Structure formats: structure tokens, C-alpha cells
Design a protein around this ligand. Structure first.
Ligand SMILES: Nc1ncnc2c1ncn2[C@@H]1O[C@H](CSCC[C@H](N)C(=O)O)[C@@H](O)[C@H]1O
Lengths: 265, 264
């Protein structure tokens, strides 16, 4: 008679919480989705072996169109789990799935797990300084979206950091790169010319957060745009003016140039 | 011969990730602090029991003044772990401790945990629409902090939600309730009169995130400022402009007034 939204965490099969696991193991049915994001540090197979349960994967339309016909029904006579990467309800559409459950007269509980939203704290940037967040999307056809560029301007203007999620084709397993993203932002700057993103903009790239060996690199576009950050997914962040302690952290941990100590503080 | 920053999670000792549990288990020395936040659903004894280790609990002074004297030293000949509530680097100054470790030639690793910063997702408010965050601090003597007021103001002009961490005086065992925060804000409103936080302001309260039954309530200040949201810890959120589905969640799940649907 219960539905459990359980987060899988950041990178691999051990990023689930001890709570999430013990609850997942005692569920009659376990569903999962990997369209919002991919657990790039593990496999479906490794997740099932840790949870010790057959895991039925769900497509975007499985969830968004038929959540109440695929998942909810089983919750009336059973305890059901719904696993998602990161922290549940972070993806903007997932919270209404709870409204669906209430509507179908189903009890729903949320078991949290690490999200990149809090994990970027490893970049050294202060969490209270992050402003609005956005996603960089590919242009295509006659559509050239650039709102994420305005988010950067409005945040940085107010001395706040911008967390930038990169385009993902979960299903086709193709990630946007930090590099790709920097090129796109450069192209946008040339269209709008607002001084928001240029070769001298300082940025932070975070890759494989959650892993014991993530990649935290900080520097100016001109030096980073062709750097090898590794395998995806990448997270791009455009900091606002830094607190000296943030810059020292980017220098000593993320390998940023001494120059940001006098340029970006 | 390494140091690990391992988050313990939101509510009880089970909010630790499987990765953090199996690593803290094999560490020679385990340190911890419980002054940056409150894990309402557990005790030191159960953490210890679950980790299978003795946890030396540090104070803010131990940490801020003697981290390099208490903890890094043991890191050259042993594997040391430093536990904290929620996520170790979020809304703490712990990231600076990594610098100390490096400057002492001690490599450090971070094991994340569920943080209250992303748990806000359970309020139904889109996490990307949150703007600059702030902390509501207790007035000390003649000193009355008010900067958090301007933060709410900036975000709301932008239409973004504001996350308000609430103060904590761990040594006195005092945890600011959302009620207390709402009262502090009202008097700042009388002070500044910037029409930012009034009796008619819609707010959201999230209490004890991480537990199976957190308290999630939304509604106008006048109705909530005296309401009992249960034990600490609490956070207070002053949303910006709502999306209809945000508002639908707040009404269906957090018990807000239907009128808030009319999202202008
Ligand atoms: N489980 C929880 N429920 C509600 N608020 C919480 C909470 N845990 C922390 N907070 C809020 O955040 C403040 C501590 S701020 C430090 C946050 C911590 N590193 C994390 O990752 O969560 C508290 O005073 C309180 O206002």
C-alpha cells in the first residue's frame, strides 16, 4: 500500500543510502528510470546485484504518460520502489508524480540521496552564492535557445554563481561536453554581445562527482575550451565574483591559475 | 594515510550512503562534528554502532582552530574519517579544511550525503528556480542581523524562490524554528518596510527532511507563524513566482490555500 521514491545518488551503485537500500530490498516491486540522467559509474546489472531485485526500467513516456497505469496499480496491494538517479523530486517533473499517487489514493514516501545540486559544493564555491540554474541545450532547425545565457548574466550581475546542466540524450547515450558547452556559449555571446561569456570568463568544470576521483578543474575559457575533462556527464559552472576563500580553493584543489586571485576576487 | 570527509545525511544514521558506510568502517580513526546541523532521528551511540567505531566528536573551536593539530596529524600513518550531518561541504566552511589538509601533504576525499539543499525538492518547488540562499541568524545583544531580508527581496524581484537556513547554537542545544524565523522577519519588515515579508506572504516550511514523515506545510505567514511544525531542524522558504504545478503540489501535498493556484 506504499510507494517509495528512492534516489540512487551521483555515480555508482554504492551512492544509494543505507536507508534507500534496506527499503528497496523489502519492496515487492522495483522500478527505475534513466532518462533524466545516467549512472555513469555503474551498470544496471551492478545495481540489481546490490539491491538483489529484478529492476524494471521505465521510459520517459512510461513515467510521464502511464505512471498511474504501470507503477501505482502495484502499490495498492504491494510496497513499490521507484528509483531515480540523484535525489528524488529534483527533476522538475517528478514532484507531480506524487500528486498522481495521492490522487490514486497511494501513500508515498521519499528517501533522499546525494544530488549534484549539493555535490558541486566540492568545487569550493559557497552554496548560498548559487543563483538560478539552467540547462544548455543544442540549437536545432530554426530553433536557437539562449535563455541559459540570460541566467548567467542575471546571476553573475548579482555576484551569484550559475550551475549549468549540459544537454543529455539519455536514450542515445550522448552527452554534451563541457567543451561543446563552452563553444555554444561563445557562439551565443557573439550573437547577444553582453560580455557575459568570453575567452576571459572564468569557469569551473566538474565531472564524475560522487566518484572518489572526480575531475574538478577551474580556469579561463581560452585555456579550458579544448581541455580533456574525461568522460561525461560534465557540469559547467560560471562563478560570480569570488570570495578569497573560494578562489584559494579553486587554486589549491581545482588547479586554477594564481591570476584569479587578483582578477576574480 | 588519508582523510575522508563523509556526510551522514539528513535525519538518521541510515541516510549515510553505502559508500560512506563501508569506508568509515575501514578507517583507523573517526572524527565528527554535530554543530553545523541537527540529525533529529539518531544519536552518537547508533552512529558509532552502525560504523562499528569510536567517534571522537569535535567542537567548532577544535575544528576551526585545531583541525590541522587534531585531525591531519593522524592522517599520515592512518586512514582518518571526518563525519558531519548532511553533506560535509554544503553551507559549511569545511571546504577550507581541504586546503589545510593539502598544505599538510594529506590527500582528502569527499563522500557526499543527502543535503537539505536538494531535499527542498520535496516541497514541490522546482529546484532550478531557487535563487541566492541565506541564513536567518539569532540577534546577539544589540546586534540584529538583517541581510537575509535583502536576499529574499532580490530573489523575489527575479521571481526566484529563497532558501533560508535557520540558525543553530549547538552548545546551547537551540535550533531556530521556522516560527522564530517568521517573527524575526516581520520585525525586520517593520524596520525596513520594504514590503518583502508580511502577514500575507506565502511561505513553505520543511521540518525534519529525511524522516519518513517530514512536515511539509505552505500558506500565508499570518496563519503559520503560530503553527506547530514539530521538532527541529526546520528551514523556511519564501517562494518567488509559482508555476501552476508548483502551486498544485503545495495545495495537494503541503496543504496550501487553493487561492494560490491563481499564479498571476
Ligand atoms: N533534515 C533537515 N530538515 C530541515 N532542515 C534541515 C535539515 N538538515 C539541515 N537543515 C537546515 O540547515 C541548517 C544547517 S546548514 C548545514 C547543512 C548541511 N551541510 C546539509 O548538507 O544539509 C539547519 O539549521 C536547518 O535550518
Amino acid at each position: 500500500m506504499v510507494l517509495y521514491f528512492i534516489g540512487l545518488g551521483l555515480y555508482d551503485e554504492r551512492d544509494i543510502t543505507v536507508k534507500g537500500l534496506e527499503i528497496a530490498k523489502k519492496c515487492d516491486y522495483v522500478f527505475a528510470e534513466f532518462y533524466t540522467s545516467l549512472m555513469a559509474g555503474t551498470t544496471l546489472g551492478r545495481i540489481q546485484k546490490l539491491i538483489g531485485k529484478e529492476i524494471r526500467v521505465l521510459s520517459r513516456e512510461d513515467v510521464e504518460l502511464n505512471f498511474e497505469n504501470i507503477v501505482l496499480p502495484l502499490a495498492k496491494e504491494n510496497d513499490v520502489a521507484f528509483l531515480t538517479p540523484g535525489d528524488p523530486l529534483v527533476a522538475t517533473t517528478h514532484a507531480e508524480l506524487r500528486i498522481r499517487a495521492k490522487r490514486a489514493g497511494v501513500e508515498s514516501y521519499v528517501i533522499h540521496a546525494p544530488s549534484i545540486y549539493s555535490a558541486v559544493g566540492i568545487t569550493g564555491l559557497h552554496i548560498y552564492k548559487f543563483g538560478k540554474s539552467a540547462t544548455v541545450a543544442y540549437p536545432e532547425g530554426n530553433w536557437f535557445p539562449t535563455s541559459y545565457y540570460d541566467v548567467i548574466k542575471e546571476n553573475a550581475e548579482r555576484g551569484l554563481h550559475t550551475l549549468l546542466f549540459l544537454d543529455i540524450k539519455a536514450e542515445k547515450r550522448m552527452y554534451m561536453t563541457a567543451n561543446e558547452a563552452m563553444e555554444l556559449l561563445l557562439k551565443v555571446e557573439d550573437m547577444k554581445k553582453g560580455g557575459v561569456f568570453t575567452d576571459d570568463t572564468l569557469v569551473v568544470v566538474l565531472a564524475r562527482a560522487g566518484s572518489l576521483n572526480p575531475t574538478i578543474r577551474a580556469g579561463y575559457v581560452k585555456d579550458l575550451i579544448r581541455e580533456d575533462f574525461g568522460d561525461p556527464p560534465h557540469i559547467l559552472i560560471v562563478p560570480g565574483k569570488l570570495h578569497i576563500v573560494e578562489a584559494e580553493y579553486l587554486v589549491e584543489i581545482a588547479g586554477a591559475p594564481m591570476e584569479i586571485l587578483r582578477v576574480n576576487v
